[PDB]
Amino acid sequence: APCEDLKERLKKLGMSEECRQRLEKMCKEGTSEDAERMARNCES
Q: How many CB atoms sit inside 10 A of residue 18's CB?
């Protein structure tokens, strides 16, 4: 699945609205591993 696991974790971990909107955007065009890494840098 494209970015379902990653983007649903942005929702499940309950980061900022802006945080999700940054990360799922980068996960589409860019590498998913770098997007979730920025999710870990965003919150944890």
A: 9
Give the integer Cα–Cα distance in Å for 44 and 30.
Answer: 20
What method was applied to determine this entry? NMR
Distance between CA atoms of residues 44 and 38, nearest Å: 9
**Helices in the chain by DSSP H: which ranges?**
4-12, 17-29, 32-42
- Could you tell me if 37 and 9 are in contact, meaning their C-beta atoms sit under 8 angstroms apart? no
What is residue 37's DSSP assignment?
H
Residue 19 token pair: 């945080």
- Contact at 8 Å (CB) between 35 and 24? yes
Please count the CA atoms within 13 angstroms of the CA of 20 that sit on its side-chain side: 13
